[PDB]
């Protein structure tokens, strides 16, 4: 039951409870061993636990396909510290170390509990006998494919080697297959399900985007005669949500260009909101001062390009304003998501302009054509363009903002609770959109 899992969670990995109820359900679904499983959770212990913990209770060997030795090494080392009988198979292993491991796996009841392996070996003719004998002797408990997204040309990290993993699944019929990734759109999910030949019904555990404490809205720069004024009001409202502490928290303004960053910081400062520009144009000494001053709460507002380093995060960010629409929905989600980590209410505003859209739309097309000359045509290029369109749709359409973000990532409808402009006043947004339409000339 639940009992066996909970003990071995503390007994071996030393945790009281699973981080989330989702991480628990996933782990349990892998334990039952009746269904192929797909885990999409942000990088961390939670994800790895979903195959590692079950690997031990299995009473057989779990094979884990991972794309490169670096990632394999991190894990074998961490598993070894927990006194776990883990091994790796790759070319970088010595001829003698190799012969020893192969001998261990040919042995009735081997010591290897978890075997990490690269996609080339997992599919190479030289390894199939070993795989077959393990199968014959019912010693194969699970096949795990980490970095599952790598199978997809529509993903960011396409690896041809991952296309061979499909044929392997059927051979390991007896054993359930677990596919894990941090990052998959609906389209990348489909490629994983198909290319790895997962057996239906596939159980899906996918950490949702939604955060109840973030109020999202879009403002149309085309309808606003005082832009710098509108931003000042927005900044001051978001700060001083604790009237007796006065001005509490900090904020980020994101801009595409360095000129825009310098200019906006000045326009905010001159209206009584202390802001400093942060961009790649500044020297390292300047960048450290600006970051320190913002992290230490000396200057409450930082105006930055995409360049803003996340060396450490900040829990009290009360607002994230995008002066310019981002390259991609993933970019916007990640940048806007730097707000409200503490759990307290926060504001995410996108200042949208058809002029900004056209300019960014055009720049993406140019940087794609530049990479097409260097590395050739790819399906990933069209994912880059679709990634922007989801954000253009976010700005120019009526509907919950949290829903539009959920749709792009492949989450279910989230529980918005008047947590975006549309859900708090549909007609207001309709009126604003109608007005943008009249301005279209």
């Amino acid at each position, epitope marked *: 039951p639940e009992r066996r899992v909970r003990s071995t969670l503390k007994k071996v990995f030393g945790f009281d409870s699973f981080k989330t109820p989702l991480q628990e*359900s996933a782990t349990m679904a892998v334990v039952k061993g009746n269904k192929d499983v797909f885990v999409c959770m942000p990088t961390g212990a939670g994800k790895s636990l979903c195959y590692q913990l079950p690997a031990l209770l299995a009473k057989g060997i779990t094979i884990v396909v991972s794309p490169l030795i670096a990632l394999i090494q991190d894990q074998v080392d961490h598993l070894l510290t927990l006194k776990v009988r883990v091994s790796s198979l790759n070319s970088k292993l010595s001829a003698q170390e190799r012969k020893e491991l192969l001998a261990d796996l040919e042995r009735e009841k081997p010591q290897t509990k978890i075997l990490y392996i690269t996609p080339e070996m997992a599919a190479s003719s030289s390894f199939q006998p070993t795989l077959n004998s393990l199968v014959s002797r019912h010693l194969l408990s699970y096949l795990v494919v980490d970095e599952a997204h790598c199978v997809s040309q529509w993903g960011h990290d396409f690896r041809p080697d991952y296309l061979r993993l499909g044929a392997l699944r059927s051979r390991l019929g007896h054993a359930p297959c677990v596919a894990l990734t941090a990052t998959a759109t609906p389209q990348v*999910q489909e490629d994983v399900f198909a290319a790895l030949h997962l057996k*239906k*019904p596939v159980a899906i555990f*996918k950490t949702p985007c939604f955060r109840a404490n973030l109020f999202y809205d879009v403002q149309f720069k085309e309808l606003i005669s005082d832009p710098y004024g509108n931003l000042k009001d927005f900044c001051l409202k978001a700060l001083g949500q604790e009237a007796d502490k006065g001005l509490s928290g900090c904020g980020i303004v994101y801009c595409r260009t360095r000129e825009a960053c310098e200019q906006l910081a000045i326009e905010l400062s001159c209206r009584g909101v202390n802001a400093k520009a942060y961009h790649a144009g500044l020297k390292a000494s300047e960048r450290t001062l600006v970051q320190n001053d913002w992290m230490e709460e000396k200057v409450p507002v930082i105006v930055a390009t995409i360049s803003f380093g996340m060396g450490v995060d900040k829990a009290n960010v009360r607002f994230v304003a995008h002066w310019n629409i981002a390259k991609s929905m993933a970019g916007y989600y990640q940048e806007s998501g730097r707000a409200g980590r503490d759990g307290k209410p926060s504001w995410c505003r996108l200042y949208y302009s058809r002029n900004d859209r056209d300019q960014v739309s055009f720049l993406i097309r140019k940087e794609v054509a530049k990479l097409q000359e260097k590395r050739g045509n790819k399906a990933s290029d069209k994912a880059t363009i679709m990634a922007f369109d989801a954000l253009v749709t976010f700005c120019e359409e009526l509907g919950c903002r949290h829903a539009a973000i959920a749709k792009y990532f492949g989450d*279910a*409808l989230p529980a918005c609770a008047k947590g975006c402009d549309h859900c708090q006043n549909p007609t207001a947004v309709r009126r604003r959109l109608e007005a943008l339409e009249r301005s279209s000339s």
Partner: nanobody
Amino acid sequence: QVQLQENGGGCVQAGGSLRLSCAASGSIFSINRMGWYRQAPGKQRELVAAITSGGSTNYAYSVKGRFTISRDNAKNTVYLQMNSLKPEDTAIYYCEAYGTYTLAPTGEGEYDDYWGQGTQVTVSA
């Protein structure tokens, strides 16, 4: 989970028309492909027609130019316009929701194929 409601079956004169429909209900994010299969009495189930989300269509040769599959992606509904029906079209018609992605706000979900119960089509000579 997913329920498939099929409709539009019946008895018609050869040369007549029907429209089969199949609405899928549940916590459905998407369906890769919606399709019509048919099984005539004591004969193997065959593909009549299928349409991806995308609108790529696929017809059995014996119905090309007579039958038209179409899909409302937002209502998870597929349609089969059947014209110039022939006796040989007599069968139980099944809908397939291939690659159905279901998901709750918790993040638990499924990817599965689902089938309807079947709807009788009979064509009298």
